């Protein structure tokens, strides 16, 4: 019939008391056969009332059914598809307002506790999933997915649930499989990509480390399979998040390369300050120095080769090659503070432990004069400690323990215990650079590798 009479009858069913009759009536109006023949764009507000009472009610799968029938009634041209996309974005916005209402009820309930929202959250999340599954394989819907993605992303931000991301990601995977299954819109791929960027941004907006990294690896696969290069505006913070992941995740060379890429992306944005460039270069340089050496071909297959599939590279360089490449660069090398460069030249070339530690006592407090030393201490500290180990092995073999205990003792910001010293030496020996014989009858250490 008429949208206004439909709204009147839904209002009457609000009045008498039965809202499910309002839902069924609005379903009758929207899903009628004549909506196929009549222009769906003209009859918009019946769907709006359907949305209103559906929010009042608890029937989200019938919402999905009504929306899918209203698609099925208009499958030829773009006008009705834009109309249904608008009503779908309105539905997503309205259920997000309902989620805010449930949040304020939960806040009041918390105050009463001091002085089941999960049901409504599950209902609304399943409504989101039904909307997402419904809008698959349809082409001309463009702003529709953008609106749905944005409001769903707000939904994921407001509440903390890790299984919702898994469900959403796998369902998008199946949707892209279906889209491949039924292949004139080149914005769809970029739309999924931007959904992924919002996923990453919110996943790092609140206390997550693996969700964002999984979305990021999917983003890498999407870049490489597709043609277009993502937005530098969002890729800057995207690689900031990617750097946030590489703190303990494993290989630190990937952290160095990604933080280099963040420096590269920050080199052209309107917000450009040169002391920030100095600080970013110092951070990159200290992180690169913190990277642990890897000079020995391993046994069999080290399972740390699948990571380099995140930064477009496959060949395996060493830390020395990476730092030489950093030296070959210009943007970083013209902005690093000179004291860190001095300490670097102390660390690697002519790493005589006595003079290196003395220059550490000279330059470590000054290295903390600017707020950059807190970034990477532990791997750099382990590097200097392993350097003490290797230099002591090179120097002499016949020696007692306590001499090593005091020749390995480090200044305040990089110091450890004696058992820490022994355990670090033990696990550097487990790597099997040079085997050692450690006796304790007179507390002696002897480096024995027959040349």
């Amino acid at each position: 019939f008429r949208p206004e009479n439909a709204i009147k009858r839904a209002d009457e069913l609000i009045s008498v008391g039965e809202k499910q009759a309002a839902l069924q009536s609005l379903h009758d109006f929207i899903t009628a056969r004549r909506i196929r023949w009549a222009t769906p764009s003209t009859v918009e507000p019946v769907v709006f009332k359907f949305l209103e009472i559906g929010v009042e009610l608890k029937k989200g799968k019938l919402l999905k059914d009504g929306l899918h029938q209203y698609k099925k009634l208009i499958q030829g041209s773009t006008e009705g598809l834009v109309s249904v996309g608008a009503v779908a974005r309105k539905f997503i916005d309205l259920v997000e307002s309902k989620i805010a209402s449930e949040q304020t009820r939960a806040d009041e309930l918390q105050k009463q506790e001091i002085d089941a929202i999960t049901s409504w959250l599950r209902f609304t999340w399943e409504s989101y999933r039904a909307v997402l599954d419904l809008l698959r394989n349809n082409a001309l819907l463009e702003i529709t997915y953008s609106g749905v993605v944005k409001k769903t992303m707000h939904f994921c931000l407001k509440y903390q649930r890790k299984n919702e991301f898994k469900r959403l990601a796998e369902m998008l995977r199946q949707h892209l499989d279906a889209a491949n299954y039924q292949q004139s819109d080149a914005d769809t791929l970029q739309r999924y990509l931007d959904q992924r960027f919002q996923q990453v941004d919110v996943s790092v907006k609140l206390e997550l480390w693996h969700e964002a990294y999984r979305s990021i690896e999917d983003v890498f696969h999407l870049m490489k399979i597709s043609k277009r290069a993502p937005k530098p505006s969002t890729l800057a913070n995207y690689y900031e998040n990617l750097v946030k992941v590489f703190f303990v995740s494993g290989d630190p060379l990937l952290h160095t390369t990604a933080w280099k890429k963040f420096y590269k992306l920050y080199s052209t944005n309107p917000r450009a300050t040169e002391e920030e460039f100095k600080t970013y270069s110092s951070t990159i340089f200290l992180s690169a120095i913190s990277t642990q050496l890897d000079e020995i071909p391993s046994i069999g297959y080290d399972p740390h080769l699948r990571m380099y599939r995140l930064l477009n590279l496959d060949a395996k360089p060493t830390r020395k090659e990476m730092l030489q490449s950093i030296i070959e660069d210009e943007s970083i090398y013209g902005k690093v503070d000179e004291e860190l460069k001095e300490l670097y030249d102390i660390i690697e070339v002519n790493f005589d432990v006595d003079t290196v530690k003395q220059q550490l006592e000279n330059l470590l407090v000054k290295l903390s004069s600017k707020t950059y030393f807190s970034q990477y201490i532990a791997p750099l500290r382990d590097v200097i400690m392993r350097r003490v180990f290797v230099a002591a092995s090179q120097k002499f073999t016949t020696v007692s323990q306590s001499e090593l205990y005091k020749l390995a003792t480090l200044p305040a910001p990089l110091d450890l215990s004696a058992w820490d010293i022994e355990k670090s030496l033990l696990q550097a020996a487990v790597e099997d650079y040079v085997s050692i014989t450690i006796d304790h009858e007179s507390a002696k250490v002897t480096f024995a590798k027959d040349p």
Binding site: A116, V245, H304, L426
Partner: protein
Amino acid sequence: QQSLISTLEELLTVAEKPYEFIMAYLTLIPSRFDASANLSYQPIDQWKSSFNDISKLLSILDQTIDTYQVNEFADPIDFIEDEPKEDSDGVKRILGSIFSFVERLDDEFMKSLLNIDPHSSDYLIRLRDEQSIYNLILRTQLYFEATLKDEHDLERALTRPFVKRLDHIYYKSENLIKIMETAAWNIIPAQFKSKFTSKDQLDSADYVDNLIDGLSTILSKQNNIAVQKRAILYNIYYTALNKDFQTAKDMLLTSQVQTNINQFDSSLQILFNRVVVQLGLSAFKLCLIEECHQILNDLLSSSHLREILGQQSLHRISLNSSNNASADERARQCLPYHQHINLDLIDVVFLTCSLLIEIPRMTAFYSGIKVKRIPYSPKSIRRSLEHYDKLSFQGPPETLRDYVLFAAKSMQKGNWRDSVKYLREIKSWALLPNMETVLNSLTERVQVESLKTYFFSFKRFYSSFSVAKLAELFDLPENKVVEVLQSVIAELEIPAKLNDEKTIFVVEKGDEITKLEEAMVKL
């Protein structure tokens, strides 16, 4: 049905005699239940009205005790009988009614609570109504113990309320059970006939256990064996909850109820699952690591822990299978939320067991010694470690399994502080009834297993390493360290010069290459 229900209520209002009241209720209450028999759960107000006029039935019988069924001169009724015609005796063909009403209410209530959101307030008020259901159970038990006199008939008609007294009591602590009993006895100002004389004293502590054990003792005398197995499983349930673990293990060994349980229905197996996991948890409370290792090696060996234990919603079970016949079957055996034992606690207990049993032994296996480690425990922590070793992510922890695996990797590496820090970070331990002592025992055992795995790991690049310094830096008594070292040397016979007057080793002899060379030189 609804108009007939209203008509019977009208006739109850018109009726005057108590026997007419009881007959009208006997015609009406099952009509209401049949009007609410197709539904999953009944209207709360209508179900409470059925509860209330069932209690009305019981109270009016209490006003007409043993008189509506005339005395044993003629046990069947004598006066007007031509109209209903359904009067043959007054023993069990008419008396066997009210417990049926109670149990129908209880079945509908259980289906409702499984069909209600556990975290909602309506679930809590339904629990408050379950309190009244148990009080009605007690009132019905009192009335039925009053009615039947012959001990055979009394037993046959009164073991069922013993089962009911079990079914809604066993889980809570003794205090709240005493409170429930006192409240029920207050709700009945007058009636008092019981086999066990509860009203006389409610001031002792060894009373809930005594009452439940008396229920099991009285229950063991009737012919039904499945009910007897049910009662012994409930005894295990209660003992592993409150009493201790030694008694539960001893009566498990006394009852040997293992072979008749799977041939029967699934409820027996469900209760077996719950009591076995409960006793494993209690053994871990009493610091029995290898014991609960042996215990939980039955349910967690298989991948599924949802169906077998029975702790689940319906959406999470409606996707594993897609047919309607089992969607009402795969969910019918579901378990009440006021009964649940945390899956997180079970998983972290089993994972801690795997960490304490395997990692030192797997270190000894990797070192080169093969003398003892024959078996391969199903679904151990080694498979999780290998699967983690198979993937591309090696970063921060995500769940309880990740924290357990990282505690295992710190265990392997040589330290113990990261493992205990993760265990304190593992927040599945907030449900331990005993916190301080079990945490101290776990800390000491983490220390000792780290020291053992360090003994296994480094004996090749070492020729001498300290033992008392290890004890000081690992917080273990030195004598306990040397005793653990002697135990290890008995288990493996490691070639090593071990001393107490010296506290210094002499290890450089040879692990296995020398022995193979010796055997080849032999012949």
